Amino acid sequence: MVHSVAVIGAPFSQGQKRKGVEHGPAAIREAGLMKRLSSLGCHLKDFGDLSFTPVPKDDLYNNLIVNPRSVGLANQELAEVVSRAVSDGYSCVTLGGDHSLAIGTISGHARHCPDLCVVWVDAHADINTPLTTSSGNLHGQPVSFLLRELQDKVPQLPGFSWIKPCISSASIVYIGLRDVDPPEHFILKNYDIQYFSMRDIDRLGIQKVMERTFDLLIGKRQRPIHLSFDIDAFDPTLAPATGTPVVGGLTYREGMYIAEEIHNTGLLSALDLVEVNPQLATSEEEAKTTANLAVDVIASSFGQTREGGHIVYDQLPTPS
Amino acid sequence: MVHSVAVIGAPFSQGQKRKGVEHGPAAIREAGLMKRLSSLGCHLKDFGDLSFTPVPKDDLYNNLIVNPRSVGLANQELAEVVSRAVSDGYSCVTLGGDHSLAIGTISGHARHCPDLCVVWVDAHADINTPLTTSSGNLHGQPVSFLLRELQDKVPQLPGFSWIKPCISSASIVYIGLRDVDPPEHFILKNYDIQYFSMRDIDRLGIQKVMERTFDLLIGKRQRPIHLSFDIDAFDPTLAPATGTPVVGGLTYREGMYIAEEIHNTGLLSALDLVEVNPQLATSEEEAKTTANLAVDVIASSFGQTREGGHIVYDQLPTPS
Amino acid sequence: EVQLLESGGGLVQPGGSLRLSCAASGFTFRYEVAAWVRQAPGKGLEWVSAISGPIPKGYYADSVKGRFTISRDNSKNTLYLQMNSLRAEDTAVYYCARLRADLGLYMDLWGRG
Amino acid sequence: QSVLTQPPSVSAAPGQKVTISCSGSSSNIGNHYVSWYQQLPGTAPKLLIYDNSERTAGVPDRFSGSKSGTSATLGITGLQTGDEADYYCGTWDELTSNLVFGGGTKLTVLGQPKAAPSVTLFPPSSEELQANKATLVCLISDFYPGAVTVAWKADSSPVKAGVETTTPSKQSNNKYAASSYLSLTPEQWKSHRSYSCQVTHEGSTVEKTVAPT
Ligand SMILES: [Mn+2]
Ligand SMILES: [Mn+2]
Ligand SMILES: [Mn+2]
Ligand SMILES: [Mn+2]
Questions:
Q1: Do the Cβ atoms of A74 and A52 come closer than 8 Å?
Q2: How far apart are the C-alpha atoms of B50 and A264, rounded to whole Å?
Q3: Ligand nearest to the CA of B179
Q4: CB–CB of A60 and D97 under 8 A?
Q5: What are the start-end ranges of the E strands in chain B?
Q6: What is the largest CA-CA distance in chain B?
Q7: What pathway annotation does it carry (chains A, B)?
Q8: Of B300, B266, B294, whose CA–CA distance to B278 is shortest?
Q9: Strand intervals (E) in B191-239
Q10: Is D122 helix (H, G, I), strand (E, B) or coil?
Q11: Which of B22, B23, B98, B139 is catalytic?
Q12: Ligand nearest to the CA of A127
């Protein structure tokens, strides 16, 4: 057997200033993702890029400022595709699209893998409730929908009643945090959610951060890993084609190291790469840099090394 | 009680190539300093930006290449304003302007707080005597005027006889050094001034650097802290709108960490942010980046966190 | 540092066909939502067509649906409007515009017409 | 178009102030953000204002947007002659699923005295009636500013069909001209007591009437 990878485009957003994020899937593709995954020796299955259609009204307005029901229903279609990809025996890679798609991927991942854990790499905790933030900011709430302890703080919206909370507070760990709303800070502290801010990373170093993240998640038993990786986790100089750029993020090397440690476990079952928005780039070069970096995270998460040695080499040719 | 902050513009320079630094105060303002300080919950007092008038002759020439008497007299007016701000119970923030303004702020700080210590964050030691460097380079001498052991090496200039040396050699520590003239190196070694170059920082890491800086300064007793922060301490790619850019400086995160450690003491009584020169920027974007970074240092020095939690949050809203 | 230039307009008979172009420069139109708006001489502005998302998808006014087709060539960084079964009442100056959203919708860049 | 209502024209002197109203329904301005577009003669519309009151880069504070209920206003203070444009409001209509616009407002910065129009109305020639045709000609001269509304009356009744009105244009003496044509059958012409040409200039109407002899 060789390691099998399924790839899904989920070009999901709520429009407004972040409409361009629906072009992230195609941009990551055009930076040569499937070729890189093929060179690794992965058996590949492409579901292509899913339609994102506003319900109940598919007009220009509802496509540029998207009602939340549309985001709820799109995530429900996504969950089933991820659960198909996983039931078929593929580690499932979903290309964003905004971080609201984590509602689809983690729910769908959790169906056949209920004991999964989550490594959330992001500048943001994305844990606001529909009551702590606005109606067009579902990209900043995915985790409130999935977390089990938060059920009584989370109202029932049209398009989101399908969702079964599938993560406990000890089963998610955050890496990269540097932009956290006050209620998000409250939730983290109150419900004991473990997190490594950029300050923690500066103090401990990323090597120790990954050692502690695994101690918390897989310290006692082996469990399927879901990597939810926001490109905005990287410093804005490395990944500028993103919608909420925050100065002081991961360097390229910290980000590859995360991805190498995740690979080295042998337990990566699902991966999101979100928030690549090529229209917010000032130049083609900013667009391509952000898209090349996303490809590097996915490749590295599935066994690309920096020192070579992934593919087996037998002997050297002799002169003649 | 809540923590009170006074803000002073000191748009001081000696003209020549560095004339644009007189626009740093306004540039830091227009990057939203007072709003950020207000969100922190600080009680705020604005003295505005001081006039910088050449004496004895206020003509175009003397405004473009400024005689030192003018710098001496401007620093004397500054010292009194800082001592007013401090006697009124405000931690005093002075926006530069070139680093010569430290002559005003430290002298004025020292009047009611004679036991103060100094953390000087800079690529430069700014410790040349009027005899080791030229007449239009007072920006590279402030510390020779203030240091006690150096009295006999420092001549009496018109406009600077008001000054009472108020710092001992054990009461200043330098962080960021990478551009040090030979006589500045002599002074450091000869008078046992403790300093952490970028090489020391590379070897020890900034966490240990701050631990040792406090051991030297506040190891024995609690003392008021003066942070004199040159924007040119940061790598030129992070802060390019500066007059002496030196490659290989602090990263954003090292610089925020310094500022967080200073805050965590509870002893920050005065802060300079100097050497923001928007006219040396190649673009608006270089100007705004340098000005945003200055605002981040001041905010972080007064309790902005990366992980949130500064402002108190009580409970979460319930569904209905 | 950013502009739009239309071409292809002129004189055509009733029941005729005609294709307008709109080349963008200084930005990548591809990742942007684009629109056609028209002005019958000495009168207001009528919205005609819009093209959004990565598929992409086209939206039309009922006064043109089934006669006009909006498209784009990402290679030529150009926007098109194909106009079939044309009527006297279709007589107008035609602008291509960039359509964006924040709280609401707005057209922040117009071509020459 | 013209789902949204604007005044056809407004005027004030240089340095002075003006507002332009934009009137809609519950399904457009009522529930959606208004944008304001400036069009200088022979040029492309420019976005001034979006989300009711957000100015674009370069637009100064004397250009101000506001919105209440189902109406919106554009305030312009410090009028310069460079403000002389046609101004349009625009938003979304959730009734027709259209981006919608007002009919526009011609702004004039007064450089000469208010001059009301001279109206001459000619009936069908004896000759044209032989040909089984009828045209009434309304000649409109020496008005400033260069904006008029033209309404035709059959007796006192509103006439809609068979009206062609030119845009105002610049006479050699710097005042504006326009013309208006009503097409009739000879039976229509001969079967009404009078037809009238009514020209509104700055809220005051000049009326000319003719009758079949
Ligand atoms: Mn995120
Ligand atoms: Mn994020
Ligand atoms: Mn300095
Ligand atoms: Mn320096």
A1: yes
A2: 60
A3: 4
A4: yes
A5: 4-10, 43-49, 91-96, 117-121, 172-177, 194-197, 225-230, 268-274
A6: 75
A7: Nitrogen metabolism; urea cycle; L-ornithine and urea from L-arginine: step 1/1
A8: B294
A9: 194-197, 225-230
A10: strand
A11: B139
A12: 1
